[PDB]
Amino acid sequence: KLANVVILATGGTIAGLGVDKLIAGVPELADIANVRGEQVMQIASESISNDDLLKLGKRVAELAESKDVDGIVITHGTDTLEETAFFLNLVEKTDKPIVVVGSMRPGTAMSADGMLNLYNAVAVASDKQSRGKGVLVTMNDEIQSGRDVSKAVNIKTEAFKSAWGPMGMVVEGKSYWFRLPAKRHTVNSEFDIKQISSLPQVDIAYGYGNVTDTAYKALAQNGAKALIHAGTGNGSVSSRVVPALQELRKNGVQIIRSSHVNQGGFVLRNAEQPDDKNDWVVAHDLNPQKARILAMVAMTKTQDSKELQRIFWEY
Amino acid sequence: KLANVVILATGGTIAGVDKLIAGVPELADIANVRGEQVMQIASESISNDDLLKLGKRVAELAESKDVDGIVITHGTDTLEETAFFLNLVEKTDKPIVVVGSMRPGTAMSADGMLNLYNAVAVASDKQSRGKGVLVTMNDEIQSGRDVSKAVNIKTEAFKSAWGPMGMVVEGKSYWFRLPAKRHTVNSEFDIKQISSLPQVDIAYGYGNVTDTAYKALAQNGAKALIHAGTGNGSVSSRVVPALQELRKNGVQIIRSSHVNQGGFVLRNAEQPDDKNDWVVAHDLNPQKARILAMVAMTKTQDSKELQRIFWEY
Amino acid sequence: KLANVVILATGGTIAGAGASAANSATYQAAKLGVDKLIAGVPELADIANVRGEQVMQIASESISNDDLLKLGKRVAELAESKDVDGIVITHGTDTLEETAFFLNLVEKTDKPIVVVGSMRPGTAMSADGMLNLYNAVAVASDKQSRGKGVLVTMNDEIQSGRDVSKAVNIKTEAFKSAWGPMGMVVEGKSYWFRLPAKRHTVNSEFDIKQISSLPQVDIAYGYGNVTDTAYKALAQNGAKALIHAGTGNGSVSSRVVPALQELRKNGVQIIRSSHVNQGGFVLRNAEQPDDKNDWVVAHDLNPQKARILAMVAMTKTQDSKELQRIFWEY
Amino acid sequence: KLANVVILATGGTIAGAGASAANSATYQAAKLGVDKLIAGVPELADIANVRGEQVMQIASESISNDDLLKLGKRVAELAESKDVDGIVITHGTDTLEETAFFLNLVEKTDKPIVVVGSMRPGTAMSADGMLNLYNAVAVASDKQSRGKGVLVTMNDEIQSGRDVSKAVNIKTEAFKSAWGPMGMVVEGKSYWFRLPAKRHTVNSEFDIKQISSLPQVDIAYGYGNVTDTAYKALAQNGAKALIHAGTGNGSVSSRVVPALQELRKNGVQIIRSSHVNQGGFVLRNAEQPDDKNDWVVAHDLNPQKARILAMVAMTKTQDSKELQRIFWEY
Ligand SMILES: N[C@@H](CCC(=O)O)C(=O)O
Ligand SMILES: N[C@@H](CCC(=O)O)C(=O)O
Ligand SMILES: N[C@@H](CCC(=O)O)C(=O)O
């Protein structure tokens, strides 16, 4: 008796309803699982919204809770795949496999990667080995953690990378594992989608030579409840920007120091800025867009900067 | 006989210039070195005025017959931006090397001593002539054009998608690739003709992003905006209208990305650049693309010329 | 208060010395005693109660199986002591990976074991060993390191002793794993991101207490126009297993397959590894009919790693099916 | 209006076939002829005037020196023809990197030569060969490819044939260079970022037109507890050079040095490479006294690459100092 896998489609070039086309076009899935599909949205992923994430997250929770669902696959555009994957990893309190998957090459193109990617995603979602591992991403014959995998290379099929390595590989339908997650996720998370009805607004500003405070102030004036600073180096802040950040913090905007140095390492508390004195937070190893996701989720529960720091150290 | 190398210090934790030099007595074996303190900043705080001053000084020194090569000691946070700028604007074949250290020189196992030795070694080497600006960290010879700070904390921080061009070991340089892109002597740009740098700013793309940062940055003076998009410089549907509006208002729109380990942003792929009169940044990360756009806008505001530039440099 | 950490010195560049500070590459390995190595890092005393022993003083390219056993037995004796909280081995980098894996297989302890070396001698400008040794002692003293298997702490990284390997020459980032670092160590603090998945230490079926002498295992290389000569000669001179370092997915030339069949028939185990070592793994029954031939694939393990696992496994079994299970579990 | 490109087929996974679409890894190589390869990509007509020839039909792990010569001589004949603008070779991935370096050394032409394979057979879901082949033909037809040396065009990359290696098993990103890709090929279009520094093709001192049969060169591996047995056996059975695939910086065990000294004195060249293949290079006089012993270091070249260069080099010289020059220039 094969596993029952539900594919929740959101758009992207992997659809080459989109979900019906996939289920019709990859008849090999039937070898490895009983598939059914639902079109949760039809979007280019760069245009995803928080309302989209909530709808998706709620749906995945409903399915996870059903006795007739064994694993879930989410098909997605590649641009913000990493953000959805981390979101789900924080809010879905389930041990059932959840896999997110896309295609780097346009789905109808010569040698396009999506077909095998989707076959692998359904394989992984149907595998007992996937239970309790958090959200997974299955691109380039790899099993990557949805927490810290990122789109790192443009164009190429090897696009999705993590500083901490792949956890496994998927080959001819079989999963081979080499590492386990360390960080908090899914059933061991403090967050639960079932209790989240809205998400706070979080925005991201970049650091670079000759940067001013303008983007920071403007983003806050248009509703940001936290600012993810994408700094140079070790979350460094220009001396022209620090005063604004102090003022914004006082005004109640959380200040989270991430970086655009995203192949490896992490941002160290109290190294480049006096985070304790200013009541700021460091994003640890998390890239800016990952940091935004964590901040948003966390701020559904707490606005205590020390708790936020704990969170950024545990997830 | 030894090369005449000048060390231009600008700051960073590799750090005065006289201390740096005194800290590596071994420099004397490989070159005749002199020092000048151009500035003393944390490189995250660098300004365009600082870049202009450094660039002009490097050109003045490169014109001297008493100078064979130039090492610039720098904070690592915007090293990559400085190195690229110099690669664009200095029309000299003399070696120009930019160097820093990921650990403080007071730290255990600090990397700066040997970095600085190697920079001086590369700056004195005939093989370095005509190679464009070089960066010499982690025993590598990296191109200033496309090396970037990619790993935090670790001494292997500076990486290029196109690989190291060479290595430096026990003072000797070993080359394996050559640059392909326009630089230094073959640049159309010259610091000696630049007295002003146009304001260029950068905005980030992510889920649920709005047009707010872009509009605000333009309102506060940006002549070009570098879009650090998701994926292949992709732009949210919520942002496209503002970008069109800002282009008609005269702001150049340059599509870069935060996908920085390899590949490049393809024209007309994710957005209709010809129709909108936008530019793609090719392989250049956002902070690199800013540098190029600012230099290029000293000379042209033609988006087609700008695109050429982004495909040649 | 402070952890009691023992440093077992074995040689290497970390104990090396060059003629000048510029000699980061041309120098003499394995010159300095352990007490001198401890004295070069006064800061160790802040983070642990340390003491040293000189187990051996070798250039690691010249290590022997007897040296592995010696080291492995002393580590066991220390791990069984109430007075020892963690152990650091200083080692040459050339075969560091082989030793670290060996210890991960045979040391049935959850006490931290850390193997460390350096790419530059301590005499050199910007020498890396001071910080490497500090970080080693930090990791060895940290409760987070318990039950994690053998660790390697070079270049600010916590790597698994299983699958870290020397991958880059000259540079201080020399040690890499296909599956990533598991963590980092920065201002002596350990930050974890991944856990091991493979069997090690406490959960291993193997124990250095049982091993009296290791079986002879040798390695032969695959390349264009390769013949069966090296395989045959190595078996004629005592190899009980051959590790084939093939091209591609452990591929075997048609010129070589017949010899390997005959060797297997004559009781020599035949293990297919590769010289394609940045990622992936060797898949059973893909390039060659391993079930027909009664051969074993080395999975992700590089040739020199495969050799260590082969030797440890052959102390318990001569059944190729079991050997394959072992190559899939460890 | 279109460039004339000749495809020379030699076998490989690119020409392979498995039983079902999901057989991406377990299949038969070297089953399809060139005509069918070309038929599988009708889009080639858009970009070039292509003709195909079947040179051989092999799994590339079983390649011989005879086969390289045969291929190299056919490539030369085509290069000399006015009716040929560029050349593509389809090849198994396992020794692709050996062939591509060989060709880089011996083909005295600026006309583009591209070597290409695939990691999955054409029958597989998401098979990589079609686009690889398309992109090879595009690069072979591009004026920007002239004078660049032999190129390899897999995974949307333009890699130098000198120093690209098969580094990752299973995945389509198999081929890597320590020195980076030189460019990318996308929508048929080539995008260059680096140029070669090393000697190649028209600037080579070697020429396939002079080579009648290649010297025998073999490879032996370094690891813990290694002996001199492989080196001596290989030499006894005809090796005119030995490639030492050392640990670390081409390091040699003290149990092996005496045999290598004896062999060099008996006329066998001794080349120190390594199995540390992601970066760096082997430094002369560092780990061994090369000048004293009259040995050669392979610089950054991996063992199988060093074997190729040594074979070519030895068609011209037996002077170890000239061989060292060659290892420093090519
Ligand atoms: N921007 C598109 C690209 C196509 C794709 O990756 O699916 C997306 O993210 O939806
Ligand atoms: N943020 C400091 C760090 C110190 C350094 O890298 O030198 C700078 O870039 O100047
Ligand atoms: N080959 C020597 C020195 C190399 C090193 O330790 O880095 C050894 O492995 O002991």
Ligand SMILES: N[C@@H](CCC(=O)O)C(=O)O
């Ligand atoms: N081992 C075969 C198939 C592997 C491949 O081509 O990818 C060969 O090298 O010909």
